[model samples]
Target: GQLKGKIAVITGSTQGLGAATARLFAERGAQGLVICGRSAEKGRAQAAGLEELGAKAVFVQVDLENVEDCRRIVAEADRAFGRLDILVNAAGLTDRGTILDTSPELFDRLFAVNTRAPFFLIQEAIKLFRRDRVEGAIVNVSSMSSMGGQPFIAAYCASKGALDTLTRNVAYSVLRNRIRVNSLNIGWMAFGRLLDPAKVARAIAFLASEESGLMTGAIVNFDQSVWGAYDGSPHPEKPL
Candidate 1:
């Protein structure tokens, strides 16, 4: 297993792409897995399932709205595993509101969960991680909307745009530390009982694998739905 003996912390990992990533990582022999999400029952259940696979796993309940929660998470990991390997930021909020209708409370909450939480989590994690000289990877699950042109999701788009910038800047800033940073701009992930899990799982598995080593600072688009919007001409490449 490529990830054998490695420790991974996946935020918002109770469901969707996050849950799928955790399961696959455990299956591949990750030594210790940390599943964190706002839902305690689901998070713990996911951890228990991973343990059933013979992987030592822990569940952390974190409300990403509170950046301090990220520090506590890293502290707990130090207490248990002592080393951090992979961190996948997957928690997100998609509350709908236009710019004119968007409220400060809603915008703040969105940025907190979508942007600030991951920012500080990486900060705190890096402090603890600097003690180790081994390779560390941070993957932020951003959205393709960061490219812009999408309507009715201004706040959401802004948050993702910041993530795109942060992913690259952070990777460059920490290159000396030997830590790799990347962002996965997920298209619509079809997981759970609601959709075909196989196709989406394959993509999630790719980003989480050692094969993705060269993908540092890349904002990859995984949503296949964009093809449907085009007439299959001009390639429709640029965000449009």
Candidate 2:
């Protein structure tokens, strides 16, 4: 019952990190959830599963590529719960292409999904927070790629880097209203390997909980080893 009485809206909730977080939020006692994704089948199935878990859940199909759809995500949440307490922007796009191989279309698509959509989503969430005078929590899921990733992820890195900056600047403005925003720069995850989506979801849930009331504008790097702990290799795999 960690999040009893809370209502959360999660983007990209049909799969991966978003799906894991949605399930965790429901299990933690969220009163209502708005699960946003482009996949109707997956979204409905996820919502139905959460309903079985005792949470009131609604699936709202959203294409992050559309700016209006991004705004509507929060609107749908408000309609479902009458109010929102947590917002997790866990959806992301990771197209493999270096600068040389990147096209204008690819850049726009990456930014639309990874950066622009989340930006506007936060804008709408803050409006609701201020209107209701609720102390809201927003957690953005970024990648370690934001710090400088492999050559194949140039566009992805740039998009996440912008998102990180937005987190810091927007968090500062919302603190006066007790609205907190934070981001997680997560490491690589290969199924059962070093990182797991559920682990990242736990951190996101913590940030959304009252336990992190005083924490905002923070960018946490979730990695296997301590940063600068060793100059030599720690894992068999090299840094990506």
Candidate 3:
């Protein structure tokens, strides 16, 4: 549970689950934290908060849709800490677009944020990990949508499906180097309720820490969504 000398770079940390994970990492003794997001104000605020908790924290604003920005984020993190130990890809785009309603532009946007950005980010992080000989860990925040979703989230589901596959592929590719890669298939839950953001944060921390050294290419589900919930018929009593 302690990350006393590790440096972590977490995207989408300005709010939601990302913010919770950053705070928990700081509290658990992470040495440096790179808090990243699109909002300058929120990013700075989260960074400052983490610093107050005793970690050297820096905010890097990034547009997840831009591949260049994805590369820049890891570059900045390496520059800030001089080393990288953990990477959490938590940024997501939940725009409503069904198969019938999804435009080419909308589909592209979803994939760019939810899938492409994290893929490139992992590539950049792996470069840093190998160059510095850091046995880094990557925890990608996927969704139940990756398996299946409602009609309104057609494009979002496709993007996460791609992400889930990417997680497994990259994990296998990098296993010999000792760099673990995994994903969380999060289900629907109230932000601070039974499935609290802190719970997600703890799971991410476990994957990032040496506690899960033997684990790689894992897709852990983090919610109560049942198998039949995806379709409306089997469980009419509990509709998703």
Candidate 4:
């Protein structure tokens, strides 16, 4: 249990990768969990289930669209655990919109939930991390979309690209504090905004652990959709 006695707060964890990471973290000896999402009922249910697994879990119902609520989540976690060692910024949207067709409202909502929420939320956690003088680690869930262009997902790509850059900048910026920041530039794991929960959980557990300590400002690809033959296929193949 490398994480035994550690506290972790994951936003947008009512379902999907967030819940998987939470469950896996709990299974791996995470003592305290603060799961946040706008859906109070689902968040509480998720917390309750994790609590049953012998984790001290709390549910923070938050619409991260609001900055104040985002601040409150970290405060609540600190109140419960006294110190936070891990933060998973897994709360994000994967909606599609191209630049010209995207509305001002659409863009704001996208950034508010995707880029802005996690950005400010990390800032809040950093303040506490600095005050406590504890070595902190953060994982932002970015998409491979950030690496380059996707014609149909312009706004999403833009937000994720910003996240990728932000992850690198912050990782370097905070290296002096012994704090680690990284982004999971995920390709696919079957459970994006689609698919079921169980499969995604397994993948999330891997990314959220201290075993990932070797990683900082690194992008780990967990996509399972990449399938092609090496010798016969007309594509760059996995090296032997």
Assess the local accuracy of residue 33 in candidate 4 as a C-alpha lDDT between 0 and 100.
92
Query: For model 3, what is the C-alpha lDDT against the true structure?
Result: 0.89
Lowest summed lDDT across 10 adjacent residues in model 1 is found at: 188-197
Return the TM-score for each candidate structure.
0.87, 0.93, 0.92, 0.86
Candidate 2 RMSD to the real structure: 3.1
lDDT of 4 by residue, 1-240 (tens): 867888888887898778888888888888999999888788889989999887899899888889998989999989988988888898887777776687777777778888888888889888888999978888888876776556667888888888888888888888888788877666643433543446555555555566765467776654533423245655324432
Each candidate: RMSD to true structure?
4.3, 3.1, 3.0, 5.4
Q: Can you write out model 3's per-residue Cα lDDT over 12-66, one digit (the tens) per residue?
A: 8899989999999999999999888889999989989999998999898888899
| Pairs with backbone N, CA or C atoms under 3 Å apart (clashes), candidate 2 | none
Clashes within 3 Å, all models in order: 1, 0, 0, 1
Q: All models: lDDT?
A: 0.78, 0.88, 0.89, 0.79
Task: Please state the error at residue 235 of candidate 4 in Å.
Answer: 16
Candidate achieving higher TM-score, 1 or 4: 1
lDDT of 1 by residue, 1-240 (tens): 867888888887888777887887888888888888888898878989999976788888988898778877777777789888888887788766777788999898889988998899889778866887757888888886777735577888898888889999998988878788888776544532333434554555566567776567777766654523766544334442
